Design a protein around this ligand. Structure first.
Ligand SMILES: Nc1nc2c(ncn2[C@@H]2O[C@H](COP(=O)(O)OP(=O)(O)NP(=O)(O)O)[C@@H](O)[C@H]2O)c(=O)[nH]1
Ligand SMILES: Nc1nc2c(ncn2[C@@H]2O[C@H](COP(=O)(O)OP(=O)(O)NP(=O)(O)O)[C@@H](O)[C@H]2O)c(=O)[nH]1
Ligand SMILES: [Mg+2]
Ligand SMILES: [Mg+2]
Lengths: 330, 178, 328, 178
C-alpha cells in the first residue's frame, strides 16, 4: 500500500466515464478507500476483446437458424459495452474493428421484414430473427454508445446510423418503441442535431410508404392505450420536435404539421389521464402552443395607448414644472 | 480461515442498503443515501464452524455502471433485487441485472429477491400504481420468472418490518456451499 | 305587335345569363325597343344540338387523322357553349348527355402525352398539338360562367384535379389560363380545400417531393411572358392568404418560403412591368413574421407595467406636492 | 331595292362605336359608354344604284356573349376589330371573334380591321407597352394573320384622324357583293 501522491487514482477514475458531477463527490474520499479502489481496477480484467464479438456478428450477415444463440451474443456485447472500461468502447468503435458499422448492418438485417410487411434471400431469414429480442437489444447497445462523449459524436456524423434508428420504431414491442423515441429525442437537442432527426423521418416516410411526415408516429401514439411509459416518452418527443426550433415561423409550421395529423383533438381526450408523468407532459406541450390569431388581436390597431402614455408623459413634465416653481416660491 | 462473499445488486432505491443494514443491525434507516460502494462483515457459524460473511453493497444508478463491476471478482453468491411495488425494477432484472452478473461471473449462483413486501397491501402504493395502469408484482409472477432465468430460488423480504429477512441470507449462504 | 309584352321579355332575358347589374340596366328600354329584342330572340336559331358534339368527340377516343378536324370542332364547341342561350348549356351538361364527363374524357386523352414528359398511346402525341388540347380548358371556363355548372365543376372530383394537371403544358398562354381558372375555384366557399386535394393529386402522379413545386419551377425560370407571371403570382398570393385560419396561413406561407419563393422574389421585385410589380408587392405586404409579433407583444405588457409605473409615479409625486403646499 | 347588312364585332373599348360615329357624322365623341346594341342606316351610291347601308354595333364585354348573336342573322359582311396598341385585343381575334362569327354565320366574308393607328407614334403608349415587354402590331404582322384566317383583306384606320376611315367601309362594301 505505497503512499506516493495518489494520481495513480486519477487514471482509473477517468476510464470509468463518470460525470464531472460524480467526480466531485468521489475524489474527496478517505485515503485508504481511495487506493483500495486503484488496485481493484488493476485486478479487474476483461473477458473478451471487441474483435471476438465483431466476428461472430458479421458472420450472421449473408436452414440457417444456426444463429439461434445470437441473442445472447448481443446481450453479452451490450453488457460489455456498458460496464467495461471506456477503452473497450473506443477499441470497438475505431477503424480497425469498425464496430458501429457491423452492428448497424445486423440491425438492418433483423429489421427488413417489419419495415416491409406494410435482398430477399434474407428477407425470409429476417422474419425469424425479428421475433427475437435481437432488434431491441441492438438498440440498447447504441443507447450505451451514445452516453460516451466521443462515440455519440461518431453517431451523428454517420449518415445511415440515426436513419436506421428512426425505422426502429416499427418493432412490435411497446418498450422498444419508447427507447427509440427517448434516443431520437436526445440526438434532437444537440446543436445541428435537429435536422438529422427530420431527415430520418423523411427517409422513414418513403421506406414505409406513408403520406405525411410521421403520421406513423401519430398512429402508434394514438391507437394504443396499453402502455403508460411509452406515451410519456412519445409525447415529450413531440413537445421537443416542435418548440425547440430557432425560427418561430418554422415552429408554428410544425405545430400545424401535427395538428393536421389530429394531435390536438386527441390530446383533449388524453388530458383526462392523471398518470403524473403524462399529465405533466401533456400540459407542458399545451403551455407552449402558438396562436398567431391571439398575437394579432392584441396588436389590433393604432397602439393608441402610446399617446395615452404620451398624455402621461406630458403630465409628469407639467407636474415637475410646478414643483421646481415651488422651490422658487420657497 | 474461510469466508463467504455475497454481493447485492439491483435498481436504485429498491432498498438494497436498508436490506443490509436492517439485517446486520436491527435499526431501520429512513435516510436515503445513494451508495457508491460499501463493505460489511459479520461472522456466521455453519455446522459449528466460524465463517466470515462478506456483504458488498453496490450502486443502482446507471452512472456507476462502469464502477460497480469492481466488486464482482471472486463472488460466491449474488442477490438480484427488484421491488414488488415497482414493476420498473422488475423488468430490469432480465434486461439489465441478471445478464450483467452472468457476463462477468458465469457459473456463479444467485438468488432472486423481492423487497418491500409491506407495501403490497398499502392503499397509497396500490393507488399510485393503479393510476399508471399497473399492479404490484404477485408472488406467482416472481417465481414465474425465476425458473426461466436459472435462479437458485425466489425469496422475498421486507426490511421495515423485519420479516422473512433472516431467511433470505440463510438461503444465500445455502447457495454458496454445494 | 302585342300590347302587353312584359312577360315575354323577361322569359327571353334570364335565358341569356345576364348579371343583376346588366339585366335592369337594360330593363328600362322603350317599349318598342323591347319588343325588338323579343322578336330577334325567336328569329335566331341553333344550328347544332349538344348531343352532336358529344358523339364526334367521344369517338375521337380509341395513325392518320380522323382527328384532323378535332381542333376546329372543339373550337366551335367552345363557341356554342359560350354564345348560345343558357338552355343549350343546361342540356349539354345534364345527366342523359353527361357532357362534362365526356369532355373531361377527351382532355385526359390528349394530355397524357404532356404529363409523361416531365397502355396504348397511339394517337395521343399528335392530338397533343397545342390547339387541340387548350380549347378544352376554354370549354370549362365557359361552363364555369354558368352558376349551376360552376358548382357542378366543384363537386365533380377529377375535374378540378384534371385542370391542375394541364399546368404541365409548355404553352405560356395555356399555363396562365389554368392558373386564372384555379384561382377562382380557390376563393369560393370551401373551394380552397378542393384546390389542395388537386395539387396533392398532382404530387403523386408527377412523382414529386413537395406539393406545389413543379409550379415553382415554371414561375421562376421563364422571363419571356409577363402576363403568365401575373396570373401565376396571383394564384400563389391567393392560396396562402385567402385562408380563414391564421395558423394555416403561416403554415402555407412557410411551405412556399422553402421552395425558394422569397429569394426569387427579391430579384423579381426588380422588374419594371407595372402589372407584375403590383401583384408582387401585394404578396410582400401580407407576409407574417411570428418573431416580430411576439417581440411587440412583450413590449405591450412591459409598457402596461410602465403605464403602471406612470400611474404610480404621478400619484406619489402629486401627493407630495400638496403636502409641501400645505406646510407653506 | 337592296340593302347591305354590316356588323361590327370586337373587343371592348377597341373603338367600334367611334368608328361608326366618326364615319357617319365626322364628329368624334368624348363620352365612353359600353354599347349594348345599336342600329344606324345610311344610303350609299354604287354605280348609280341606291343601297341602304346597315351598320350594326355590338358589345365587346363578355357579359353580352349570350346576347350578341342576335345581331348576327342575315349579315353580308363582318368587321373584326382590334386596337394596334393592345395585343390582348389582337389575339382575341383568333381566340374569340373569328371563331365566333364562323360558327354563327359561315360562308360570310369579313375584313380584318385595325383601329387607333394614331397612337402607334404616341409617347405615353411607347413606355406603357414596352414596360410589359410587348410592342404594337406592324402592318406586316396583321396581313400575315388575315392571310391565315381566310379573311378577305386587312385595313387600318383611325377614327380620330379619319385617316383611311372611309377606305375601310368602301373596301368592305366591295366584299359584301360576291
Ligand atoms: N416500505 C419500504 N421501504 C423501504 C424498504 N427498504 C428500503 N426502503 C426505502 O426505499 C428507499 C431506498 O432504500 P435504499 O436502501 O436507499 O435503496 P438502495 O438499493 O440502497 N438504493 P441505491 O442503489 O441508490 O443506494 C429508501 O427511502 C428506504 O427507506 C422496505 O423494505 N420497505
Ligand atoms: N386615340 C384614339 N382613341 C380612340 C379611337 N377610337 C376610339 N377611341 C377611344 O377609345 C375609347 C373607346 O372607344 P369606343 O368607340 O367606345 O369603343 P367600343 O369598341 O365601341 N367599346 P364597347 O364595345 O364597350 O362599346 C373611347 O374613349 C374613344 O374616344 C382612336 O382611333 N384613337
Ligand atoms: Mg445503496
Ligand atoms: Mg360600341
Amino acid at each position: 500500500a505505497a503512499g506516493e501522491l495518489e494520481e495513480r487514482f486519477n487514471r482509473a477514475l477517468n476510464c470509468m466515464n463518470l460525470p464531472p458531477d460524480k467526480v466531485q463527490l468521489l475524489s474527496q474520499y478517505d485515503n485508504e478507500k481511495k487506493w483500495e479502489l486503484i488496485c481493484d481496477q488493476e485486478r479487474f480484467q476483461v473477458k473478451n476483446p471487441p474483435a471476438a464479438y465483431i466476428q461472430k456478428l458479421k458472420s450472421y450477415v449473408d436452414f440457417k437458424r444456426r444463429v439461434q444463440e445470437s441473442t445472447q451474443v448481443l446481450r453479452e456485447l451490450e453488457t460489455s459495452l456498458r460496464t467495461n472500461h471506456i477503452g473497450w468502447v473506443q477499441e470497438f468503435l475505431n477503424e480497425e474493428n469498425r464496430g458501429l458499422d457491423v452492428l448497424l448492418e445486423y440491425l438492418a438485417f433483423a429489421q427488413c421484414s417489419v419495415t416491409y410487411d406494410m435482398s430477399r434471400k434474407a428477407l425470409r431469414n429476417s422474419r425469424i430473427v425479428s421475433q427475437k429480442d435481437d432488434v431491441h437489444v441492438c438498440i440498447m447497445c447504441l443507447r450505451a454508445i451514445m452516453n460516451y462523449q466521443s462515440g455519440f459524436s461518431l453517431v451523428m456524423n454517420h449518415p445511415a446510423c440515426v436513419n436506421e434508428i428512426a425505422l426502429s420504431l416499427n418493432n412490435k414491442n411497446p418498450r422498444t418503441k419508447a427507447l427509440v423515441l427517448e434516443l431520437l429525442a436526445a440526438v434532437c437537442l444537440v446543436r445541428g442535431g435537429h435536422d438529422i432527426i427530420l431527415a430520418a423521418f423523411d427517409n422513414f416516410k418513403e421506406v414505409c410508404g406513408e403520406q405525411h411526415r410521421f403520421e406513423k408516429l401519430m398512429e402508434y401514439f394514438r391507437n394504443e392505450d396499453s402502455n403508460i411509459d411509452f406515451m410519456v416518452a412519445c409525447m415529450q418527443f413531440i413537445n421537443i420536435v416542435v418548440h425547440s426550433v430557432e425560427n418561430m415561423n418554422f415552429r408554428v409550421f410544425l405545430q400545424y404539421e401535427f395538428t393536421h395529423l389530429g394531435l390536438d383533438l386527441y390530446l383533449e381526450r388524453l388530458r383526462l389521464t392523471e398518470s403524473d408523468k403524462l399529465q405533466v407532459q401533456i400540459q407542458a406541450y399545451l403551455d407552449n402552443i402558438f396562436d398567431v390569431g391571439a398575437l394579432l388581436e392584441d396588436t389590433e390597431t393604432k397602439n393608441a395607448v402610446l399617446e395615452h402614455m404620451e398624455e402621461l408623459q406630458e403630465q409628469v413634465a407639467l407636474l415637475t414644472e410646478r414643483l421646481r416653481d415651488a422651490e422658487n416660491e420657497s | 480461515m474461510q469466508t463467504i462473499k455475497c454481493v447485492v445488486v439491483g435498481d436504485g432505491a429498491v432498498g438494497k442498503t436498508c436490506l443490509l443494514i436492517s439485517y446486520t443491525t436491527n435499526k431501520f434507516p429512513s435516510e436515503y443515501v445513494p451508495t457508491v460502494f460499501d463493505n460489511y462483515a459479520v461472522t456466521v457459524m455453519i455446522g459449528g464452524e466460524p465463517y466470515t460473511l462478506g456483504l458488498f453493497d453496490t450502486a443502482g444508478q446507471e452512472d456507476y455502471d462502469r464502477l460497480r463491476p469492481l466488486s464482482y471478482p471472486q463472488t460466491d453468491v449474488f442477490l438480484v433485487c427488484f421491488s414488488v411495488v415497482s414493476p420498473s425494477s422488475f423488468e430490469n432484472v432480465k434486461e439489465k441485472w441478471v445478464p450483467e452478473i452472468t457476463h462477468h461471473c458465469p457459473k456463479t449462483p444467485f438468488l432472486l429477491v423481492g423487497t418491500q413486501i409491506d407495501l403490497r397491501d398499502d392503499p397509497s402504493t396500490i393507488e399510485k400504481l393503479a393510476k399508471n395502469k399497473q399492479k404490484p408484482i404477485t408472488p406467482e409472477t416472481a417465481e414465474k420468472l425465476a425458473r426461466d432465468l436459472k435462479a437458485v430460488k425466489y425469496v422475498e423480504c421486507s426490511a421495515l418490518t423485519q420479516r422473512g429477512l433472516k431467511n433470505v441470507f440463510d438461503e444465500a449462504i445455502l447457495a454458496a456451499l454445494e
